[PDB]
Amino acid sequence: STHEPLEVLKEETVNRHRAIVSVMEALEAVDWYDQRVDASTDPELTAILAHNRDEAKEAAAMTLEWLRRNDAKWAEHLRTYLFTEGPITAA
Amino acid sequence: STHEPLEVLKEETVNRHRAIVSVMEALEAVDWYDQRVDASTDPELTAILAHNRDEAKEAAAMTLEWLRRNDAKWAEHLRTYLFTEGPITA
Amino acid sequence: STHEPLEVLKEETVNRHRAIVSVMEALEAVDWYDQRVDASTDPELTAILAHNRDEAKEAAAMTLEWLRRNDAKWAEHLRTYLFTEGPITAA
Amino acid sequence: STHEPLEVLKEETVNRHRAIVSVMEALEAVDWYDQRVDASTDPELTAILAHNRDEAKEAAAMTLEWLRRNDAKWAEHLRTYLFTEGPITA
Amino acid sequence: STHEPLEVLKEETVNRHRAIVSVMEALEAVDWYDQRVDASTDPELTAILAHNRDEAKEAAAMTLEWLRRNDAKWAEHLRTYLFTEGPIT
Amino acid sequence: STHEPLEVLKEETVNRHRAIVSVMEALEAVDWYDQRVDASTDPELTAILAHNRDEAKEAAAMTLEWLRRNDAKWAEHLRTYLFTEGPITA
Amino acid sequence: THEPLEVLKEETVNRHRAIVSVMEALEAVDWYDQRVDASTDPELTAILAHNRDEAKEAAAMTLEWLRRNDAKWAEHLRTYLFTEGPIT
Amino acid sequence: STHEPLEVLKEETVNRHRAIVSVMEALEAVDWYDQRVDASTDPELTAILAHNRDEAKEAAAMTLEWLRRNDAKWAEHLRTYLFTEGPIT
Amino acid sequence: STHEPLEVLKEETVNRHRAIVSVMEALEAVDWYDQRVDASTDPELTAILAHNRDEAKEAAAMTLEWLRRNDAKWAEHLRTYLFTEGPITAA
Amino acid sequence: STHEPLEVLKEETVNRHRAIVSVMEALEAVDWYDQRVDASTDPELTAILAHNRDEAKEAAAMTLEWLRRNDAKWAEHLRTYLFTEGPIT
Ligand SMILES: [Mg+2]
Ligand SMILES: [Mg+2]
Ligand SMILES: [Mg+2]
Ligand SMILES: [Mg+2]
Ligand SMILES: [Mg+2]
Ligand SMILES: [Mg+2]
Ligand SMILES: [Mg+2]
Ligand SMILES: [Mg+2]
Ligand SMILES: [Mg+2]
Ligand SMILES: [Mg+2]
């Protein structure tokens, strides 16, 4: 699934890759479930879709914390920006 | 861009969509840049690639903070897990 | 996201479409998560990936039950094969 | 057809992959067949598509049972939710 | 799902489009199921896959018969080649 | 181009794969050529496209006869439905 | 298409139909020829090679249409086709 | 990037592959550039896009001549249809 | 061919979109042509491919100057980095 | 990520490939961000997207200069067209 061959990649690069694409897929799941939540005309499907939407938000948060713990620059930038107030582009 | 038609989606949903896919695109850029840094055999090229890799992390972090501010569940789950100690799943 | 234009589709069909593709995406995440579980050389990431692997299984299951309650043939074929013994083709 | 290389994947993980993508492809055919059932303006084609739609639902059902027999968590979660009454998220 | 817009296409063309992509999708499933039959190391799964493989051939054949009945050239060319002997060439 | 690796596939499975995808690609060209015939506003182009469309039906028909000859269930299922009368779903 | 139809000229849309018909024919020639090399069944190989060459013919016809209906295709095809010596 | 694996392909087949897909990629750029010429509302961009549109036409033609020189059936079929008069079919 | 619907885009934006993806496609032809130049074992074909590779570079160049003339930040950032000496990151 | 296999590619060709695709990916980021700048109905988000849009223009510029230093024909053609006035063609 990696774009470069595995023998030229440091083991750590490959685990960050596995974590990053797991976040990507959770995010995409959040977006698509929410869109189906707005568009659904069956209220029982909608509760299911919204529950799993929020489970996918959780999966993303866990895996982002791993990246933060395992990457110095994710650590610095996430601290710079998450849980702040005032203009985001100026933090 | 969207999966469902724009006319049945709430304004807020569509703005969050724009933020989510931007984080996705920055995440993917992080991954691909970093793999290229490992594999690059030109150190001037490697330096560019590694610099822009970290600019993409910042772009991701900015947009995720936006999601955090505009979505109750993004705020709750990011607060449960980010900047913690001990087993993440716990 | 539908193949045929929305105006020629019955509302129920579009609701089942939303359900089916949601199961498809959940299945896919189960598969991709589990493969990363085998391949991860970081045990912290592996635990995160396995936890979310199994939440994706739950989302699949909830949404198939919705399909079952809202489709006569899903109800029939699921009843025939799930929770059986002996050769599956022989049920 | 796998994301990770075959050599680091347990044999069962690869057979479960084969089952999951087969279920995925069956589901997609159900969906597309049903949409074409609604849209076809030739009632003969419509009968074919509806018949094969349901064969495809059956193929998904068979393979899902295989998953349930070969994965403790599929078995638990399918036991929690299928053939129940009342709110699915409860 | 069509390439040209629906307002400029004849209705029969659009039904034939529905039949054709149904055949393609069944064919693709035949191929992919059969490859998994070869590669599967769990024989209970292999049996499921081979049963579904062959149900997919049946869906293709039915829908190819619909095309044959609803398209003169499908009828001509399928008549020339199917169930013949000697070099297909 | 095979979903599974070549070393685990039987040679005849791989040749049927080569035949099957050739039929698919010919089928696709029938559909796309026929759609362009309906939509074209140049009658010379229209005549080219309808000519090649029907050539594509021929390549499919040829390769489907090969499949019939080389796969027991293609033979059985094709012999059940082609050149029949009355409701197909029987 | 790329752009929406309402901003496109009708000459451009017909050329598009011709161009992608050539592209698809070209792609079929390639994939057929690769399967000709790879096939270990000679009756299939004969079929695949036969249809390969029909696809070259479908491409050639449609290219003549582009030539007759596009001034620069007519110019560039005339410059290079059926020549000898360095193509550059 | 090839359909079949490289180890079972002739180098001739693979060089013709390189030529065919290069023509395909040029053909697409001609189409997409021309569509952008129609759609552009800036006359300078439009002028750039049209020039590069026509460079792509040239690249297809050169590479198509190589195919003619290296493939007996390319040679026969191109010589039947290019630069002719009357019904192409 | 736009991610967002045309009716919400500024006309100058869609034109810049048209120029950007044209650069992208020319860049891609340069890369793929060059790889075919290295790998090709026929020099007539390699010469053809090498000629068109460089024509594609020129197409990228022309189109990027249009972007430069119609977007201040393209103009600024391109003015900082192109035709410089010494470490590219430090300009 | 290459179309041809790495073993037949010169080391520098692969490096230029890495640089080219990096520019390509930046370019796409500029476009999609800018379209969302126009379309967003939340001004805080728009500010983020406009900032990141312009960071991506910068990455493209950096990486484009690297190409200019490592490819004689990029150097010639970039020399010809960038920072000029008058008809580009
Ligand atoms: Mg949870
Ligand atoms: Mg906790
Ligand atoms: Mg259903
Ligand atoms: Mg749950
Ligand atoms: Mg059955
Ligand atoms: Mg049956
Ligand atoms: Mg013929
Ligand atoms: Mg012919
Ligand atoms: Mg020229
Ligand atoms: Mg030039």
Side-chain angles (χ1 to χ4, degrees):
Chain A
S1 54
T2 54
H3 267 237
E4 291 283 352
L6 279 171
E7 53 256 25
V8 304
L9 297 173
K10 294 141 49 65
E11 177 187 307
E12 290 66 29
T13 310
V14 183
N15 279 322
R16 291 193 303 272
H17 158 82
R18 295 181 173 103
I20 285 169
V21 304
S22 292
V23 173
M24 288 175 59
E25 288 155 24
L27 286 170
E28 186 178 79
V30 171
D31 189 18
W32 294 357
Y33 271 148
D34 221 1
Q35 290 182 30
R36 293 170 197 154
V37 163
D38 284 4
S40 164
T41 57
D42 186 281
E44 273 65 32
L45 183 57
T46 303
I48 296 165
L49 298 169
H51 173 267
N52 296 328
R53 180 200 61 214
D54 291 338
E55 299 278 49
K57 297 181 185 162
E58 191 178 7
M62 294 169 43
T63 308
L64 275 157
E65 173 61 1
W66 184 90
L67 276 168
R68 189 204 62 80
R69 292 182 185 190
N70 287 273
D71 190 310
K73 290 295 291 188
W74 278 116
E76 177 196 328
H77 287 319
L78 291 168
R79 190 74 193 187
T80 296
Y81 293 100
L82 271 55
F83 310 116
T84 57
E85 288 177 10
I88 293 174
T89 51
Chain B
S1 67
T2 54
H3 224 256
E4 294 287 0
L6 281 172
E7 52 256 24
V8 300
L9 299 176
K10 305 171 185 176
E11 181 185 356
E12 299 94 321
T13 308
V14 179
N15 285 326
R16 290 195 307 274
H17 156 81
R18 299 181 175 104
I20 285 172
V21 299
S22 293
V23 185
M24 289 172 58
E25 291 155 25
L27 280 171
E28 183 175 75
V30 170
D31 193 19
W32 292 354
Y33 271 134
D34 215 2
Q35 294 181 33
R36 287 171 197 150
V37 164
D38 282 8
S40 167
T41 69
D42 186 284
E44 296 89 328
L45 180 56
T46 305
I48 293 168
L49 297 166
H51 174 86
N52 297 329
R53 178 199 58 210
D54 294 339
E55 293 276 50
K57 300 178 181 163
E58 192 179 5
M62 285 172 37
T63 308
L64 201 48
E65 171 62 4
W66 185 92
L67 274 173
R68 197 278 296 173
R69 293 178 187 187
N70 290 278
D71 189 295
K73 281 290 179 184
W74 277 119
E76 179 189 331
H77 287 318
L78 288 169
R79 183 64 96 181
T80 293
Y81 295 102
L82 274 288
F83 310 116
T84 50
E85 292 100 20
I88 294 172
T89 59
Chain C
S1 66
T2 60
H3 249 233
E4 297 284 355
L6 276 170
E7 55 258 24
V8 301
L9 300 180
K10 303 163 201 185
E11 184 188 337
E12 209 173 339
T13 306
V14 182
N15 283 331
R16 289 193 305 271
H17 158 82
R18 300 184 175 106
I20 288 172
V21 304
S22 294
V23 177
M24 290 176 61
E25 290 149 25
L27 282 172
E28 182 177 72
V30 172
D31 187 20
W32 295 356
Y33 274 139
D34 214 2
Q35 294 179 35
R36 285 168 198 150
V37 163
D38 285 6
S40 165
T41 63
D42 189 287
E44 294 69 27
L45 185 61
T46 302
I48 294 165
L49 300 168
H51 178 267
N52 302 331
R53 177 195 62 214
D54 292 342
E55 297 276 50
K57 295 181 182 161
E58 193 178 4
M62 297 174 48
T63 308
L64 277 161
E65 170 63 2
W66 185 91
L67 273 171
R68 190 199 61 85
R69 293 178 190 189
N70 288 277
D71 185 313
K73 294 295 291 188
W74 276 120
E76 169 187 324
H77 287 319
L78 291 172
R79 184 66 167 203
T80 296
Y81 290 105
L82 274 59
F83 304 111
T84 56
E85 300 174 329
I88 290 177
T89 53
Chain D
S1 66
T2 55
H3 249 242
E4 295 283 356
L6 280 167
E7 52 258 26
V8 297
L9 296 173
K10 300 165 176 184
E11 200 188 10
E12 289 71 31
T13 304
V14 180
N15 280 323
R16 287 193 306 272
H17 154 86
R18 297 187 174 102
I20 287 163
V21 299
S22 297
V23 174
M24 285 174 59
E25 290 151 24
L27 287 169
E28 181 174 72
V30 171
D31 188 21
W32 296 356
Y33 271 126
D34 221 1
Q35 296 178 30
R36 288 168 199 150
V37 161
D38 288 7
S40 166
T41 66
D42 186 284
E44 244 96 311
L45 185 59
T46 304
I48 297 165
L49 301 175
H51 177 85
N52 295 328
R53 177 198 61 209
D54 293 338
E55 299 278 49
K57 298 180 184 164
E58 192 182 2
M62 296 173 45
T63 310
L64 274 160
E65 172 61 4
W66 184 92
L67 276 169
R68 194 202 62 83
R69 292 180 185 188
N70 287 275
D71 187 294
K73 275 290 180 183
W74 276 119
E76 175 190 327
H77 287 323
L78 292 172
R79 175 50 72 192
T80 298
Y81 294 106
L82 275 53
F83 307 110
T84 58
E85 296 173 288
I88 294 172
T89 64
Chain E
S1 67
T2 53
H3 279 218
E4 294 285 356
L6 281 171
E7 52 256 24
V8 300
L9 299 177
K10 307 181 73 172
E11 168 177 33
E12 293 83 15
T13 305
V14 185
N15 284 328
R16 288 194 307 273
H17 153 79
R18 298 180 178 104
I20 289 169
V21 299
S22 292
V23 179
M24 290 172 60
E25 291 157 25
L27 284 171
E28 184 175 76
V30 168
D31 188 17
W32 294 353
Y33 276 136
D34 214 0
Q35 295 181 34
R36 290 172 197 153
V37 162
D38 285 7
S40 165
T41 62
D42 188 283
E44 298 111 300
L45 181 58
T46 305
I48 292 163
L49 299 169
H51 169 88
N52 298 331
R53 176 198 59 210
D54 294 346
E55 298 279 52
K57 300 181 186 165
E58 192 180 3
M62 292 173 45
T63 309
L64 279 155
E65 171 59 0
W66 185 92
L67 278 175
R68 190 201 60 81
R69 293 181 187 188
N70 285 277
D71 184 313
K73 273 286 182 183
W74 274 121
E76 175 192 328
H77 286 314
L78 290 176
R79 175 54 92 185
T80 297
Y81 293 101
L82 276 284
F83 306 107
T84 60
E85 288 176 317
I88 298 172
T89 76
Chain F
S1 65
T2 53
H3 251 193
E4 294 285 353
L6 275 166
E7 56 257 28
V8 299
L9 295 174
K10 278 166 187 153
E11 176 197 312
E12 283 63 44
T13 305
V14 184
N15 280 327
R16 292 195 303 273
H17 157 79
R18 297 186 173 103
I20 286 174
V21 300
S22 291
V23 175
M24 290 173 58
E25 291 156 26
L27 285 165
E28 185 175 75
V30 170
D31 188 20
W32 293 357
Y33 274 140
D34 215 2
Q35 298 181 34
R36 290 170 201 151
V37 160
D38 282 7
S40 165
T41 60
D42 182 286
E44 283 69 68
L45 182 57
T46 299
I48 296 167
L49 302 174
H51 175 85
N52 295 329
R53 176 196 62 210
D54 293 342
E55 298 278 51
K57 298 178 188 164
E58 193 182 5
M62 289 173 39
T63 307
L64 201 50
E65 168 63 7
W66 185 93
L67 274 173
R68 189 199 59 81
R69 292 180 185 190
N70 285 273
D71 187 293
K73 280 286 181 183
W74 277 117
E76 177 189 326
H77 283 320
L78 292 175
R79 186 163 160 175
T80 296
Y81 295 101
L82 273 54
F83 308 110
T84 58
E85 295 182 327
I88 293 169
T89 58
Chain G
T1 53
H2 225 78
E3 296 283 355
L5 281 171
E6 53 259 26
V7 302
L8 295 173
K9 301 191 300 152
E10 188 204 305
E11 300 98 283
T12 309
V13 182
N14 279 327
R15 290 198 301 271
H16 158 79
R17 299 185 178 101
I19 287 167
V20 300
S21 294
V22 178
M23 288 172 62
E24 292 155 25
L26 284 172
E27 182 172 73
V29 168
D30 186 18
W31 294 356
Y32 272 133
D33 217 2
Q34 295 179 36
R35 288 169 201 148
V36 161
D37 285 8
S39 167
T40 60
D41 187 283
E43 175 149 61
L44 182 62
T45 301
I47 293 165
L48 300 167
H50 176 266
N51 292 323
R52 176 197 59 210
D53 294 341
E54 298 275 52
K56 298 179 184 160
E57 195 182 3
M61 292 173 44
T62 305
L63 199 47
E64 172 60 2
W65 187 92
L66 274 175
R67 193 201 60 80
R68 294 178 188 188
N69 285 279
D70 189 296
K72 297 292 292 188
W73 278 118
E75 175 192 328
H76 285 317
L77 290 171
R78 184 64 85 182
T79 294
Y80 294 102
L81 273 55
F82 308 114
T83 62
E84 290 180 327
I87 289 174
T88 49
Chain H
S1 81
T2 53
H3 212 71
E4 293 284 355
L6 279 168
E7 53 258 26
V8 309
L9 295 175
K10 298 177 175 65
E11 186 63 27
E12 277 72 34
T13 308
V14 180
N15 276 328
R16 290 198 304 270
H17 156 79
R18 297 184 174 106
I20 284 167
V21 299
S22 297
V23 173
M24 289 176 63
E25 290 157 32
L27 284 170
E28 184 174 74
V30 170
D31 186 17
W32 294 359
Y33 273 134
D34 221 359
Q35 292 179 33
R36 287 170 195 152
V37 155
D38 281 1
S40 161
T41 59
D42 185 285
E44 172 62 85
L45 185 62
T46 301
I48 291 167
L49 301 172
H51 176 267
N52 297 334
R53 179 199 57 209
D54 288 335
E55 296 275 57
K57 300 182 183 164
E58 191 180 0
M62 294 178 45
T63 311
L64 199 56
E65 171 62 5
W66 188 89
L67 276 173
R68 193 201 61 83
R69 297 182 187 192
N70 286 271
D71 189 292
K73 278 288 180 184
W74 276 117
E76 176 190 326
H77 286 137
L78 290 172
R79 224 191 79 173
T80 294
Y81 295 101
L82 269 57
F83 313 112
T84 58
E85 290 186 325
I88 293 175
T89 42
Chain I
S1 58
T2 50
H3 243 235
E4 295 286 356
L6 279 170
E7 54 259 25
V8 303
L9 300 175
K10 285 174 58 179
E11 177 191 24
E12 290 81 7
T13 304
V14 184
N15 277 322
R16 287 193 304 274
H17 156 86
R18 299 186 173 103
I20 287 169
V21 301
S22 293
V23 178
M24 291 177 65
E25 288 153 24
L27 281 170
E28 186 176 78
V30 167
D31 189 19
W32 296 358
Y33 271 124
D34 219 5
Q35 297 181 36
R36 290 168 199 150
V37 161
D38 283 7
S40 170
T41 58
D42 184 287
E44 283 110 330
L45 186 63
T46 300
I48 290 168
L49 299 177
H51 179 85
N52 294 327
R53 174 199 61 210
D54 295 344
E55 300 274 51
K57 299 182 184 164
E58 191 182 3
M62 287 169 43
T63 307
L64 205 50
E65 172 62 3
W66 184 92
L67 274 175
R68 190 204 60 80
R69 293 177 185 189
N70 286 273
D71 189 291
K73 281 286 180 182
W74 276 118
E76 178 195 330
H77 283 320
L78 292 173
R79 184 66 127 181
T80 294
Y81 292 107
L82 273 286
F83 308 112
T84 56
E85 296 96 14
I88 293 170
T89 50
Chain J
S1 74
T2 56
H3 274 212
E4 298 285 356
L6 278 169
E7 51 255 22
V8 301
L9 293 175
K10 298 174 156 60
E11 180 185 15
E12 205 205 311
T13 305
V14 181
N15 279 325
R16 290 195 303 270
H17 155 81
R18 298 183 172 105
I20 289 169
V21 297
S22 291
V23 178
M24 289 178 61
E25 289 158 27
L27 287 175
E28 186 173 80
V30 174
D31 185 16
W32 292 353
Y33 271 124
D34 213 357
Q35 296 180 32
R36 292 170 198 152
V37 159
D38 290 9
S40 164
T41 63
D42 182 283
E44 293 71 35
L45 179 60
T46 301
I48 294 164
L49 303 173
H51 177 92
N52 295 326
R53 175 198 65 213
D54 292 341
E55 299 276 50
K57 298 179 184 162
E58 192 182 6
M62 294 173 44
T63 306
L64 195 61
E65 169 61 2
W66 186 94
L67 277 168
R68 196 200 58 82
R69 295 179 187 189
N70 288 275
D71 187 292
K73 278 290 179 185
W74 277 120
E76 176 194 333
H77 285 319
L78 292 169
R79 177 73 69 194
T80 297
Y81 292 100
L82 274 287
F83 310 116
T84 56
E85 82 194 66
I88 293 174
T89 65

